[PDB]
Curated annotation (Swiss-Prot), chain B:
Quaternary state and interactors: Homomultimer. Makes the hexons and eleven out of twelve pentons. Interacts with triplex proteins 1/TRX1 and 2/TRX2; adjacent capsomers are linked together in groups of three by triplexes, heterotrimeric complexes composed of one molecule of TRX1 and two molecules of TRX2. Interacts with scaffold protein; this interaction allows efficient MCP transport to the host nucleus. Interacts with capsid vertex component 2/CVC2. Interacts with the small capsomere-interacting protein/SCP.
Role noted for this protein: Self-assembles to form an icosahedral capsid with a T=16 symmetry, about 200 nm in diameter, and consisting of 150 hexons and 12 pentons (total of 162 capsomers). Hexons form the edges and faces of the capsid and are each composed of six MCP molecules. In contrast, one penton is found at each of the 12 vertices. Eleven of the pentons are MCP pentamers, while the last vertex is occupied by the portal complex.
Gene (name only): MCP
Chain ranges passing through the membrane: none
Annotated organism of origin: Human herpesvirus 2 (strain HG52)
Name of the molecule in the record: Major capsid protein
Superkingdom field: Viruses
Localization: Virion; Host nucleus
Family statement: Belongs to the herpesviridae major capsid protein family.
Organism classification: Viruses, Duplodnaviria, Heunggongvirae, Peploviricota, Herviviricetes
Length: 49, 49
C-alpha cells in the first residue's frame, strides 16, 4: 500500500534497471581476492579438461 | 425525485485495471490539475500532455 488507501505493484520487470548492468560480468577482484592462501590438491576429476 | 443528473461517456480499453479506480482517480487518466506542476510556466501543457 502506498501513502494512501492505494495499491502498488512491484514486478520482476521492475528488476530491469539493476540486473542488466554490465557489472554482472565483473568478477576481476573476486578471483584475485580468493586466490591467496591457496587450496590443496582437490583430485581434479571434473576440474580439468 | 428532483433535478436530473446527466451521464456522459468516454471509451476505454477493457484492461485498464480497476485498481486505478476504487480511489479518487481522475477521468482523463492523468493528474491534470494546475496545482501539481513544478512552477515552470510552460509546465502545464507538459503536465497534461
Amino acid at each position: 500500500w502506498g501513502k494512501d488507501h492505494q495499491v502498488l505493484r512491484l514486478s520482476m520487470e521492475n528488476a530491469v534497471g539493476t540486473v542488466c548492468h554490465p557489472s554482472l560480468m565483473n568478477i576481476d577482484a573476486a578471483v584475485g581476492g580468493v586466490n591467496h592462501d591457496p587450496v590443496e590438491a582437490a583430485n581434479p576429476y571434473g576440474a580439468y579438461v | 425525485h428532483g433535478q436530473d443528473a446527466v451521464c456522459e461517456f468516454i471509451a476505454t480499453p477493457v484492461a485498464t485495471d480497476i485498481n486505478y479506480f476504487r480511489r479518487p482517480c481522475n477521468p482523463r487518466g492523468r493528474a491534470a490539475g494546475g496545482v501539481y506542476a513544478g512552477d515552470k510556466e510552460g509546465d502545464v501543457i507538459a503536465l497534461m500532455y
